[PDB]
Structures are given as structure tokens and as C-alpha cells.
């Protein structure tokens, strides 16, 4: 039957969004020794390095037929390449987990590695946080260089993720 191309493309457009930056899940067609090929249904399949897919333990928890959610860099790189980066999705999920952990205030870690305006600053896999000048540690600690260079093991209280800021505080933990 003559269901027009315009009307059919309308439904297909409604199914999938082409906005850059957003995250959509794609079936992994195959894995080579250093790259993973992911089909998200766009113009073409993406070729993401396996190091990105490699887990914290240097292993490939991913597999054929697995579904994982990948952030959309662009529809085309100029060579018909649907550039997709799942580590951006990892960063977005980490910001969401950081927001949850700064709302729930549970135990968490992350290498406190820099100097904030108030004091020392923390970095934790997508969480750029602060431990202030007098609040780097509870006591009068010169361990802002422990809050700049050593992992803070605490909760987060106040965070502005859009500002790339959190409070990796000298809290109860």
C-alpha cells in the first residue's frame, strides 16, 4: 500500500531523536581486539575504542548482542561516520549518580586532586568538587594537599553540576 515516504519518515523520526549530545542505546554487532562496533540505528555504525569499553578491571564486560547507551556526538563526521562516545554517557551517568549521592549522602570516594577558590578541590570521575580552606579537613589540617592529591572518602552535600561543582566535604565520612 502507498503509505507515503513522508508519513513513514515521520514515525521513524518520532522513534529516534537526532539531537547532538543525547544518549541512545545501541546493539553491539561485533567486537574486534581494540574497537567495538555499535549499531544505534543511525546513518551508520560507530567504532568506539575497546579501552573505553574496558571496565575498571581492564576486562571487556561487554559482549556481542549487549545493549549499552551511547552519547550522540554527531550524525556524520564528514565521512558518513555516526560518531558515538559511550564515555560521555558514562560521564552523564556519573553526574546523575553524583547528584543522587549528594542528595542521599551515602559513602563514596574520589581522588581529591586540586585547589578550589575556597580551598582544595576534588575530582571523581565526573565530579569536580571542593573541600574549603578551613573545611579541607575537620581539624586545622594542612591536608589540603591531601584534598589536592589524595582520595576523599566522604559524602557530598551541595553541588552545582551545571557549574561543574560539588562539595566533596570534610563530612561525617
Amino acid at each position: 500500500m502507498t503509505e507515503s515516504f513522508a508519513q513513514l519518515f515521520e514515525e521513524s523520526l518520532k522513534e529516534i531523536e537526532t539531537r547532538p549530545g543525547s544518549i541512545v542505546r545501541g546493539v553491539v554487532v561485533a567486537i574486534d581486539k581494540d574497537v567495538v562496533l555499535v549499531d544505534a540505528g543511525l546513518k551508520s555504525e560507530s567504532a568506539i575504542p575497546a579501552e573505553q569499553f574496558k571496565n575498571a578491571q581492564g576486562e571487556l564486560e561487554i559482549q556481542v548482542g549487549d545493549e549499552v547507551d551511547v552519547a550522540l556526538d554527531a550524525v556524520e563526521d564528514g565521512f558518513g561516520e555516526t560518531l558515538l562516545s559511550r564515555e560521555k554517557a558514562k560521564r552523564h551517568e556519573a553526574w546523575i549518580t553524583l547528584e543522587k549521592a549528594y542528595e542521599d549522602a551515602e559513602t563514596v570516594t574520589g581522588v581529591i586532586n586540586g585547589k578550589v577558590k575556597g580551598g582544595f578541590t576534588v575530582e571523581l570521575n565526573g565530579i569536580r568538587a571542593f573541600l574549603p580552606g578551613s573545611l579541607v579537613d575537620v581539624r586545622p589540617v594542612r591536608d589540603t594537599l591531601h584534598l589536592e592529591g589524595k582520595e576523599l572518602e566522604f559524602k557530598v552535600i551541595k553541588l552545582d553540576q551545571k557549574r561543574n561543582n560539588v562539595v566533596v566535604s570534610r563530612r561525617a565520612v
Binding site: 513522508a6 513513514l8 519518515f9 521513524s12 537526532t18 546513518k43 555504525e45
Partner: protein
């Protein structure tokens, strides 16, 4: 066997390149531009696809030697698979400049490949003072990689099915020079002037490539079997 329009949409044929790299000769085969990316009008694609299939069936019935040209790393394995499925010839790796026009030199290369493979396997002389054995094996492997598909073609092909006309422009030019029907799938950035049976569609997607190859393989198999 034809392909349904919903299947084409699922494959992702409608998608094209960005609206800055488009070729103005592909303007008729364009529906719209969503987010600075061209949308190919499948309303023209479906009838043209079936027309190209009919011509391919005619050639296959007349026992023509089809050549499947595809060099994109996405389409290399699929082109080889389709050509072997339909017992035809393919070029999965880089198209040698003047593969068809300089057939007299390609013929000598084929003979060299045949001699090397025959001696290595059938002749099985084994002991070749190491260094020569490694060199001969490496040369045979390279020749198999380059010309393994077309080694049994004998003469010139009667039809050239080409993936991504823009990428394989050289092969299209040689086919035009010699005189050969070309069945090329043309994205928005490609130039359809050299193609005889244009098939508007996305050459990049492996889904679309597999869809195209399956349809044409079925058609040529029907034509040959008769």
C-alpha cells in the same frame, strides 16, 4: 524479489550525508533536510531499485559475469559474502587502478597468482631455504587478498554493481570507458552522472548494504537458475 518500503526505512536507507557536502545532481532524489542532514526520498528509491533488479535478472539469465565492487570496510565482508552466495565475482579490497582497462596486465598478475598457489599447495615443495618460503607465502597471501575474487572471471564483467559510487568513482569511469552497465548505489554526496542504473540510498549503513546485497543476490540467483 523486491524489498518492502518499511524494511528499507528500518534498514536506514532514507538517511543521507550533511546538507553541506551534498551534490546538486542528487537534488531530485532528496525529500527534506532534518537537522542539516539530507533525507533521501524513498518514493523514487523503490521503483528504481526494482528496475535495476529487473535488468540484473535479465543479465543473469543471459549468463553475465556480475562484478560486485565494494571497498568500504563496512561493506567489504558483506560484498564478499553476497558474491560467494550468488557464485559471482567481487572486489572487497582496494580497486586497482586500471583493473578493467589494463586487463592485459591484470591477466599476467592472475597467472602469477595461479602459479604461486598451485606450486605452494599442489606442488608442496616445502623446503625453500626458509627466506624464499616466507617470501613466496607472503606474495601469495597478498595476491589472494588483492585479486582472489576475480581470479576466475576470465574476461571482462558484463555488469558492475558498485557500492558508494563516490568512493568507487575510478571503477565507474573504467566501466564507462569500456562500455558496461553500472548499478551503483548513490548517496547524497555522490555524482549520479556516470551511473546507468542509479539506486538512491545510504551506502554507509551495514544494515542497508546487507539489504541491498541480499536483494541483488536473490535476483541474480533466480536469473542464473532460471
Amino acid at each position: 524479489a523486491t524489498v518492502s518500503m518499511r524494511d528499507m526505512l528500518k534498514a536506514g536507507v532514507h538517511f543521507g550525508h550533511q546538507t553541506r557536502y551534498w551534490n546538486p545532481k542528487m537534488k531530485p532524489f532528496i525529500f527534506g533536510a532534518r537537522n542539516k542532514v539530507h533525507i533521501i526520498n524513498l518514493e523514487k528509491t523503490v521503483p528504481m531499485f526494482n528496475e535495476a533488479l529487473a535488468e540484473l535478472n535479465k543479465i543473469a539469465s543471459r549468463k553475465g559475469k556480475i562484478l560486485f565492487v565494494g571497498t568500504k570496510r563496512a561493506a567489504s565482508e558483506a560484498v564478499k559474502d553476497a558474491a560467494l552466495s550468488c557464485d559471482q565475482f567481487f572486489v572487497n579490497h582496494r580497486w586497482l587502478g586500471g583493473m578493467l582497462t589494463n586487463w592485459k596486465t591484470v591477466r599476467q598478475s592472475i597467472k602469477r597468482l595461479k602459479d604461486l598457489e598451485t606450486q605452494s599447495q599442489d606442488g608442496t615443495f616445502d623446503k625453500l631455504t626458509k627466506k624464499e618460503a616466507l617470501m613466496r607465502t607472503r606474495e601469495l597471501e597478498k595476491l589472494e587478498n588483492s585479486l582472489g575474487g576475480i581470479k576466475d572471471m576470465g574476461g571482462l564483467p558484463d555488469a558492475l554493481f558498485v557500492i558508494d559510487a563516490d568512493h568507487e568513482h575510478i571503477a565507474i569511469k573504467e566501466a564507462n570507458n569500456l562500455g558496461i552497465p553500472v548499478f551503483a548505489i548513490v548517496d547524497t554526496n555522490s555524482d549520479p552522472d556516470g551511473v546507468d542504473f542509479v539506486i538512491p540510498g545510504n551506502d554507509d549503513a551495514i544494515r542497508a548494504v546487507t539489504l541491498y546485497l541480499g536483494a541483488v543476490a536473490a535476483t541474480v540467483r533466480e536469473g542464473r537458475s532460471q
